[PDB]
From TrEMBL, chain B:
This is All4481 protein. It comes from the Bacteria. It comes from Nostoc sp. (strain PCC 7120 / SAG 25.82 / UTEX 2576).
Amino acid sequence: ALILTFLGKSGVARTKIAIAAAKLLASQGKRVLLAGLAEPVLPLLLEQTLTPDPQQIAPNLEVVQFQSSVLLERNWEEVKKLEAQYLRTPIIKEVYGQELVVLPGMDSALALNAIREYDASGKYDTIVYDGTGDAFTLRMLGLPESLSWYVRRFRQLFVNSDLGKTIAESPLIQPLISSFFNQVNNFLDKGKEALADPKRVAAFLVTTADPLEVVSVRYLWGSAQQIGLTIGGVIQVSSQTEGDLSAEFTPLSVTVVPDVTKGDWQPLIDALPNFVEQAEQAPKPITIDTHNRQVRLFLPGFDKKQVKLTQYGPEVTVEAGDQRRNIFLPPALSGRPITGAKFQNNYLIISFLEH
Amino acid sequence: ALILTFLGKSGVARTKIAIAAAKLLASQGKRVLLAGLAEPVLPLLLEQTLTPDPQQIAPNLEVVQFQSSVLLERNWEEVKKLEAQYLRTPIIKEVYGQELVVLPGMDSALALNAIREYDASGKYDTIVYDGTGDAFTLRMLGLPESLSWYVRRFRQLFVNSDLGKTIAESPLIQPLISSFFQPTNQVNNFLDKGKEALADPKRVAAFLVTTADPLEVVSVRYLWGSAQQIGLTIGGVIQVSSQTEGDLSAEFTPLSVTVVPDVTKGDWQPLIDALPNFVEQAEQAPKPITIDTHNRQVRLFLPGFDKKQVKLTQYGPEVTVEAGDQRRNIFLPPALSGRPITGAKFQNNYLIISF
């Protein structure tokens, strides 16, 4: 499925857009899941009580509310089943899933895993996700890449090292495991390949003509590029500020849409863009030119003072918008000092030494 | 210090109110730190470039911007020194802070710890925190209690298990730990101090921010109850302008609703002059939880929920209150510890639980 989401500073407008996008796509024969968070506006705008299980509200249109409490207790039962299997003496079987308290980070991990399950079921063409629309959403969506980076470092250290041997053989720990007792990369790589594919994950900016909102979504735009999230376009919603925003979002299409009054969704529905086509035509977050030995990063919303580069062996780290892209350099670039990092037309062009 | 924050659906209004509150309290002689996250509105409204370190911008007014990437990197250097101090062969000494990736949850822990450090320094009377103003801010502020509960439900399960009683009754452990290189009290002391502060309206308080749009009103009422679940005092409501007219006093009884004007073209004085007395309203507001030793009762303030969506259960050693997609595991104090529940009821937005 395509995971479709929206970024912007005003939650009510984002929810209306998500609802309208879901209605439009379901009306065209796409199988749609609209998923929101634990908050009362989506139910109220739909005039429907929502639950942690998808409910059909129209042909091809199901709606679900992610309640982290419920997702946590559902995952906890999977933890118990694994515990019985892999342990001779249970330890956490006592704890009921209804007791567990949601910690920061769990919220995003549980929501992303739920989305992954819905995506993997094959039941949907589009999963419209009405999230927080902000940097927390980006950190969620970036989990496949972020976890992959950690896994690759753990492997380098706690194993794939003498330490990996001083425990792999340790006659001290071996009996301790014998008592009471990768697939990971295929799992993460699937998430990574989806996130990078605009046919599988795309987001759209939502903003009024207020310059404060405009600068906020341009910052989110650049931050999204750091994680490889395609930004397909801009939805411009109404306010007391008038303005043509096309020049502020070149080369993206800006689509001006009307409000929703008294539950008449049709004018908004009719004004929405073709999300799939615009995502497919949007700029690419990263390209690598192996002949000229250059990395080209699309980084709208930032200038050179706001972007930091770090280069440690075969890895380059790009930090911008409080996000970090780790670039593992290919053979044409590895081992060569960076000789330039200059912005041209919202792209940062990183050059590597030829001589 | 007092940590003061704002909950609401529109970030721009929340940042404006945070700036005005900081300017107000500073002009009254309080030493103020204004702290925001990685986003461009606060610097633009202040006409000041912001950094990860406090900058004075007016008498008694310093401002700082939290960047998760920098907080993580600065925490890493402390982890790397501990390696040099308590481990035979370093493992992580070659991992560089610039490369670390911020995962979900990590961002919230790093920011709360940064706040903790600024509060511990004694340099400020008020810390005005411009956060995300939503459930994610609540899960962050609730960390001391949530962590305390995990330590308290699971320590016993792991120490008294067959595998735990073996780690104490096994000679394969002592020469294991020494192959490299009570905390339970130090941890609970650190956690209990955070829980104490959060429960004290002089140390932590939040105010709701909303327009008259019924959709915003219902949203902040839900956040209001969600905040009570974590023990966060909600001192009052700030009503900002919109195309919807309305007196909101009856919607938030017994809280004061203070109507405030916009800020246009750098003129902060109308907003400043309209802000409420934060300290006094927080002192007068309802208490999230009261334990009545005499009447053997626990009274939980739970406004803004559907009563059918408040669940009380005792699956484990403590009663669990589920509401607002948050869970409170009630630690019974001495006067109530070990007394069965004998009833519970709702009344004027309070859940009264009898023992």
